Amino acid sequence: GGWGTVPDWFFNMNW
């Protein structure tokens, strides 16, 4: 969800 690492709604949670 924020281009980071762990997956999320958008792509990868920033954190």
Side-chain angles (χ1 to χ4, degrees):
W3 316 314
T5 130
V6 61
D8 63 7
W9 165 79
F10 216 143
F11 289 115
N12 288 339
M13 196 172 58
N14 72 329
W15 272 104

